[PDB]
Design an enzyme around this catalytic site. Structure first.
Site, PDB file in Angstrom:
ATOM      1  N   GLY A  83       0.787  -1.226   0.000  1.00 23.97           N
ATOM      2  CA  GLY A  83       0.000   0.000   0.000  1.00 23.97           C
ATOM      3  C   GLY A  83       0.818   1.274   0.000  1.00 23.97           C
ATOM      4  CE  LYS A 104       7.723   0.495   5.567  1.00 19.04           C
ATOM      5  NZ  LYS A 104       7.790  -0.662   6.535  1.00 19.04           N
ATOM      6  CG  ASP A 116      -0.244   9.295   3.686  1.00 17.02           C
ATOM      7  OD1 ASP A 116       0.381   8.204   3.662  1.00 17.02           O
ATOM      8  OD2 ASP A 116      -0.152  10.110   4.636  1.00 17.02           O
ATOM      9  N   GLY A 117      -0.105   6.656   1.100  1.00 17.39           N
ATOM     10  CA  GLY A 117       0.988   6.080   0.336  1.00 17.39           C
ATOM     11  C   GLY A 117       2.372   6.589   0.691  1.00 17.39           C
ATOM     12  CG  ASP A 243      -0.069  -8.155   6.914  1.00 14.89           C
ATOM     13  OD1 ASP A 243      -0.892  -8.541   7.767  1.00 14.89           O
ATOM     14  OD2 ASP A 243       0.464  -7.025   6.933  1.00 14.89           O
ATOM     15  CG  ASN A 244       3.830  -6.904   8.984  1.00 18.13           C
ATOM     16  OD1 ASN A 244       3.767  -6.554   7.800  1.00 18.13           O
ATOM     17  ND2 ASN A 244       3.442  -6.124   9.978  1.00 18.13           N
TER      18      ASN A 244
HETATM   19  N1  LIG Z   1       0.606   5.503   4.928  1.00 21.46           N
HETATM   20  C1  LIG Z   1       0.075   4.427   4.292  1.00 21.46           C
HETATM   21  N2  LIG Z   1      -0.582   4.576   3.116  1.00 21.46           N
HETATM   22  C2  LIG Z   1      -1.111   3.529   2.460  1.00 21.46           C
HETATM   23  N3  LIG Z   1      -1.037   2.262   2.903  1.00 21.46           N
HETATM   24  C3  LIG Z   1      -0.415   1.960   4.069  1.00 21.46           C
HETATM   25  C4  LIG Z   1       0.199   3.053   4.847  1.00 21.46           C
HETATM   26  N4  LIG Z   1       0.758   2.481   5.936  1.00 21.46           N
HETATM   27  C5  LIG Z   1       0.515   1.141   5.856  1.00 21.46           C
HETATM   28  N5  LIG Z   1      -0.196   0.831   4.749  1.00 21.46           N
HETATM   29  C6  LIG Z   1      -0.612  -0.515   4.335  1.00 21.46           C
HETATM   30  O1  LIG Z   1      -1.517  -1.014   5.303  1.00 21.46           O
HETATM   31  C7  LIG Z   1      -1.170  -2.375   5.665  1.00 21.46           C
HETATM   32  C8  LIG Z   1      -0.768  -2.408   7.125  1.00 21.46           C
HETATM   33  O2  LIG Z   1      -0.059  -3.601   7.424  1.00 21.46           O
HETATM   34  P1  LIG Z   1       0.557  -3.903   8.868  1.00 21.46           P
HETATM   35  O3  LIG Z   1       2.035  -3.694   8.593  1.00 21.46           O
HETATM   36  O4  LIG Z   1       0.136  -5.345   9.081  1.00 21.46           O
HETATM   37  O5  LIG Z   1      -0.014  -2.948   9.902  1.00 21.46           O
HETATM   38  C9  LIG Z   1      -0.095  -2.825   4.676  1.00 21.46           C
HETATM   39  O6  LIG Z   1      -0.704  -3.439   3.540  1.00 21.46           O
HETATM   40  C10 LIG Z   1       0.554  -1.511   4.252  1.00 21.46           C
HETATM   41  O7  LIG Z   1       1.122  -1.534   2.959  1.00 21.46           O
HETATM   42 MG   LIG Z   2       4.308  -1.356   9.444  1.00 24.45          MG
HETATM   43 MG   LIG Z   3       3.529  -4.441   6.919  1.00 26.17          MG
END
Ligand SMILES: Nc1ncnc2c1ncn2[C@@H]1O[C@H](COP(=O)(O)O)[C@@H](O)[C@H]1O
Ligand SMILES: [Mg+2]
Ligand SMILES: [Mg+2]
EC number: 2.7.7.-
Length: 460
Positions: A83, A104, A116-117, A243-244
């Site tokens: 994301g 990242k 926000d990506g 997912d981590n």
């Molecule tokens: N600022 C952000 N903008 C868009 N996606 C995010 C952001 N931070 C985290 N994500 C996504 O949200 C998810 C959170 O995963 P986690 O690391 O399990 O909390 C993952 O798929 C990330 O890629």
């Molecule tokens: Mg994280």
């Molecule tokens: Mg993650």
């Protein structure tokens, strides 16, 4: 001069979306890992934002964002995905390895959902420091290659600078990749991922001969071994969602991590972890629950009994790695049956006195067998344990001299405490990168003894 390949893109269609990074405003390189870049064959001229801020591509790159799913805090969260990161390409090294370049903070993606990506400076600095610290501790991890900052505003709880981390890792395969296609009812995609993993990372597994059983057995083993290593150095991940979890067994996604200071089995550094699901002491149990969820995705094509037989080996493998590492940490050069009660007595003692974890073991590395030569409220109880502890070291045949030398090679002098990283982040935001570079340098020698405040308590 660099060799990239389009392995994931060509071999795993429909697991990604092709897209390019979104550059930040006035992005500039603030830190790069010079040691790692030499290992990777990267021309030093490439650091003089370019690819490090997603503003240019090197020949052979074909950027894409991977899709995946996950269980978050034990609950199915549906589709997640890359994301806020981009797989720029896969670099082949001279030893036959491939290294993902993952940017990242590279911008919006079809998997950003409502985010926000972007990443911010403080989280990319913390991730760089911790991943490099874990590597010099000898613990499998993703690596940090560069950090760029910008004048672009990113909003969390405060306004922060937008930043990007170039992460490199042998693979970004996660447990959640398999879950993604299993719960979409696409069992053949799950098998395709398993075949890809075996072909590129377990190539000695001859095709079809118990292929998946031996593969998954080893996946269990690597995750048990990783958790054992976290436990002995006092690393709390904080977000062990599926997912981590790296399929390969690397430490992955450094967010609200914490290196233990005061010894606290139920220590929690994730502010949103209300129930302490990812407390330090539940990491063994949680990693096993994550492996059980991975085992569920494999049942369409792996005999459900061979899956549970791999999962039953988890405890012995974790115990072996943990026990062998702690015995080196305690200077136990042989194996007496007094050893388990001795350790269990120390940890229960350490928890009542809130002893500093890293300091307790580093100071214990100075122990002389026949000498009884004050950080405790109950010194009487320590001298009592220290006596019975020292009587067991006598059985070991080995000198005082390099029993201390073995201990000093497994008990770090310096770990990355939260206040050390915060000091580097503060100076960084003011535009002074000296503390960030200084801290990175120190963390490349975690077993060397120090003069400065890098081994001290947090001031509090
Ligand atoms: N600022 C952000 N903008 C868009 N996606 C995010 C952001 N931070 C985290 N994500 C996504 O949200 C998810 C959170 O995963 P986690 O690391 O399990 O909390 C993952 O798929 C990330 O890629
Ligand atoms: Mg994280
Ligand atoms: Mg993650």
């Amino acid at each position: 001069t660099l060799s990239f390949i389009t392995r994931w893109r060509d071999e795993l269609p429909a697991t990604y979306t092709t897209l390019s990074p979104t550059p930040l405003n006035n992005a500039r390189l603030i830190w790069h890992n010079a040691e790692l870049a030499n290992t990777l064959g990267i021309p030093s001229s490439l650091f003089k934002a370019g690819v490090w801020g997603g503003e240019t591509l090197l020949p052979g790159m074909s950027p894409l964002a991977q899709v995946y799913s996950g269980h978050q805090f034990g609950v199915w969260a549906g589709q997640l995905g890359d994301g806020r990161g981009i797989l720029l390409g896969e670099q082949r090294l001279a030893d036959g390895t491939t290294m993902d370049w993952h940017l990242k903070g590279a911008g919006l993606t079809p998997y950003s959902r409502m985010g926000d990506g972007r990443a911010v400076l403080r989280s990319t600095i913390r991730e760089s420091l911790a991943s490099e610290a874990m590597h010099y501790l000898g613990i499998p991890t993703t690596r940090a290659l560069s950090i760029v900052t910008s004048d672009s505003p990113v909003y969390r709880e405060t306004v922060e600078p937008g930043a990007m981390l170039m992460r490199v890792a042998p693979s970004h395969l996660r447990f959640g990749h398999f879950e993604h296609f299993y719960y979409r009812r696409e069992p053949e995609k799950v098998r395709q991922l398993a075949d890809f993993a075996i072909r590129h990372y377990w190539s000695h597994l001859a095709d079809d001969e118990d292929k998946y059983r031996l593969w998954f057995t080893d996946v269990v083993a690597r995750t048990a071994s990783l958790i054992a290593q976290w436990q002995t150095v006092g690393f709390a991940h904080g977000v062990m969602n599926t997912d981590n979890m790296s399929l390969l067994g690397l430490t992955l996604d450094y967010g609200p991590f914490g290196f233990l200071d005061d010894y606290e089995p139920g220590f929690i550094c994730n502010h949103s972890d209300h129930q302490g699901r990812y407390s330090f002491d539940n990491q063994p149990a949680v990693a096993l629950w994550n492996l059980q969820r991975l085992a569920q995705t494999l049942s369409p094509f792996v005999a459900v009994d061979a899956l549970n037989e791999a999962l039953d080996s988890y405890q012995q493998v974790l115990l072996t790695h943990y026990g062998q590492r702690m015995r080196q940490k305690l200077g136990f050069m042989t194996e007496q049956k007094e050893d388990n009660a001795l350790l269990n007595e120390l940890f229960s003692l350490m928890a009542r006195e809130r002893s500093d974890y890293t300091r307790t073991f580093r100071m214990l590395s100075l122990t002389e067998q026949h000498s009884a030569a004050d950080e405790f409220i109950d010194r009487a109880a320590f001298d009592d344990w220290f006596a019975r502890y020292r009587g067991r070291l006598q059985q070991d045949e080995v000198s005082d001299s390099e029993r201390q030398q073995l201990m000093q090679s497994v008990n770090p002098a310096l770990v990355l405490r939260n206040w050390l990283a915060q000091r580097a982040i503060e100076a960084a935001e003011k535009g002074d990168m000296t503390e960030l570079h200084r801290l990175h340098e120190a963390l490349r020698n975690p077993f060397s003894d120090r003069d400065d405040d890098y081994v001290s308590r947090p001031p509090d």
